[PDB]
Amino acid sequence: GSSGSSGCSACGETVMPGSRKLEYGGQTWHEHCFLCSGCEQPLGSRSFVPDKGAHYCVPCYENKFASGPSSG
Ligand SMILES: [Zn+2]
Ligand SMILES: [Zn+2]
């Protein structure tokens, strides 16, 4: 309404609309800041699955949501 704050949640900088950026659940991350909480890969280009405050790629998601005694 009054103003808008779409700054990066990773570094804190100010994400401008005139550049490749990301926005999920309301937050905003830089195309270089938005990474995966599993392999630390830049999902700013590759697909992924937004989980509990955690961004996991196709695999990082299907793997964590997979049934198995796997310790890690
Ligand atoms: Zn950033
Ligand atoms: Zn990943």
- Distance of CA 47 to CAs 22, 68, 69, Å? 12, 24, 27
User: How would CATH label the architecture of 1-72?
Assistant: Ribbon (2.10)
In single-letter form, the type of residue at position 41 comes to Q
Q: For the chain, first and last CA: distance in Å?
A: 45
Task: Assign 61 to helix, strand or coil.
Answer: helix
Q: Which ligand is nearest to the CA of 43?
A: 2
Q: How many CB atoms lie within 10 A of CB 12?
A: 8
Q: Which ligand is nearest to the CA of 35?
A: 2
Nearest to 52 by CA among 12, 24, 10: 24
What single string gives the DSSP state of each residue in 41-52? -BTTTS-EEEET
Nearest ligand to the CA atom of 13: 1
Cβ-proximal residues to 47 (8 Å cutoff; 6+ apart), any chain:
57, 58
For residue 38, the number of C-alpha atoms closer than 13 Å in the C-beta half-sphere is: 18
Q: What letter does residue 11 receive in the DSSP assignment?
A: S
CA of 32 to the centre of ligand 1 (A): 7
Q: Please give the distance, rounded to the nearest whole angstrom, from the Cα atom of residue 42 to the centre of ligand 1.
A: 12
Q: Which residues pair with 14 in a beta bridge?
A: 7
